[PDB]
Amino acid sequence: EADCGLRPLFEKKSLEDKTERELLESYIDGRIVEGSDAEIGMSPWQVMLFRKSPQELLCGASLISDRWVLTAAHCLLYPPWDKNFTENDLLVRIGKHSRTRYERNIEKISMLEKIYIHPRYNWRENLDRDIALMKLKKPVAFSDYIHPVCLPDRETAASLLQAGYKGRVTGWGNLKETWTANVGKGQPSVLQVVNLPIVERPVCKDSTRIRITDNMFCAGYKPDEGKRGDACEGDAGGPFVMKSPFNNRWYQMGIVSWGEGCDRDGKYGFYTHVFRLKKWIQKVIDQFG
C-alpha cells in the first residue's frame, strides 16, 4: 500500500495530533486520565463492523487497502457462544467519528464479498491466531476521513514492538460494552483515543488466568498508578497502532483481542501480534484480491 499510514488531515497537512509526540517520545506523564475524545480524522483507517438487523455495532476493524478490512476472528466466529456471522449479516462503516449519527457525506457503508478467518484460528483450548480479513464488494474511495493504515514489515515489527514503547488504541468503547459487569456511564458519543505502553511478556502472564500465546502481546499501565486510560476504550477487532520515527507513518502492530478482563483491576489489554500472522494476511490479499 503506497500511501498507507499518512493521514490527510494530519501528516499530509503538516499538522500533529494532540498526543503523537508523547507516543514518539515513549513519554508517560504523571497525569491520571489518558483517554479522551479523538480529533476529527485522527484515525482514518477506523472501521465499524455493524450488524444489519438489528442495527448494532458488533466490533471494530481497520482499513488496510481500498478492498480489505482487518479484524479479530472471534468477532465473526465463536462456536461456544453460537456466534457465526456470514457476509450477508454485516456491513462495514468507514470514515466515522460519531458513534450513533449517520454521518452523511463523510462516512461510507460497504458490503462484504467474503470473510477469511485464519486457518489455524483456535478457540478450543485457548484463543490463538485471533485474526480475520474481510474483502469488500466494491473498492472504497479514500478521502480526508477514509485512508488505510500500514502493516509492519520485518524490521518495523522488531523495532517498534518493544516493552515500554507506547502505542495507541482508538474505538467507541465496544470492548467495555461487551465485557462490562455493569453498564455505568454509557458508550462514548464520539471516537475515543488512549495511548498505552507495551508491557513485558512475563508481567502480562502473571496478571491473568487467560493464556497469553506467542501470537499475542499486551499493553497498559501498572495497577499501581490510578490511571484512567483504558484498553476497554477500544473495540474488539480494532487497531493498536504506533507511529514510526523512521518514515512518519502509522503502522497497525496489533488487533484488540479477548476482553474478558475488562471488569476492574486496571488490567492489561491483549492484542493479536499482526506481524507474526502477516504471511497469512499477505497470502490472502495477494492471492484472493
In short:
The protein has 289 residues and is of the alpha+beta class.
Walkthrough of the structure:
It is built from 5 helices and 16 strands. It has helices at 20-25, 154-160, 174-179, 201-205, 278-288; strands at residues 36-37, 46-51, 56-63, 68-71, 77-78, 83-84, 90-94, 108-110, 112-117, 132-136, 166-171, 192-197, 216-219, 239-243, 250-256, 269-273. The chain has 2 domains: 32-43 and 149-275, Trypsin-like serine proteases (Thrombin, subunit H, Beta Barrel), CATH 2.40.10.10; 44-148 and 276-289, Beta Barrel (Thrombin, subunit H), CATH 2.40.10. The strands form 3 sheets. It has a 7-stranded antiparallel sheet. It is globular, with a radius of gyration of 17 Å. It has 289 residues and is of the alpha+beta class.
Helix content: 10-25%
Q: Could you please say which CATH topology of the largest domain applies here?
A: Thrombin, subunit H
Q: Tell me, what is the CATH class of the largest domain?
A: Mainly Beta
Q: What is the number of independent domains?
A: 2
Number of strands: 16
Number of helices: 5
How much of the sequence lies in strands comes to 25-35%
Overall body shape: globular
Q: Distance N terminus to C terminus?
A: 13 Å
Sheet having the most strands: 7 strands, antiparallel
Order of helix and strand elements from N to C terminus: HEEEEEEEEEEHEHEHEEEEH
Strand order of the largest sheet: 1-12-11-14-15-16-13
Structural class: alpha+beta
**Full CATH superfamily name of the largest domain:** Trypsin-like serine proteases
Question: What is the radius of gyration computed over CA atoms, rounded to a whole number of angstroms?
Answer: 17 Å
For the record, the CATH architecture of the largest domain stands as: Beta Barrel
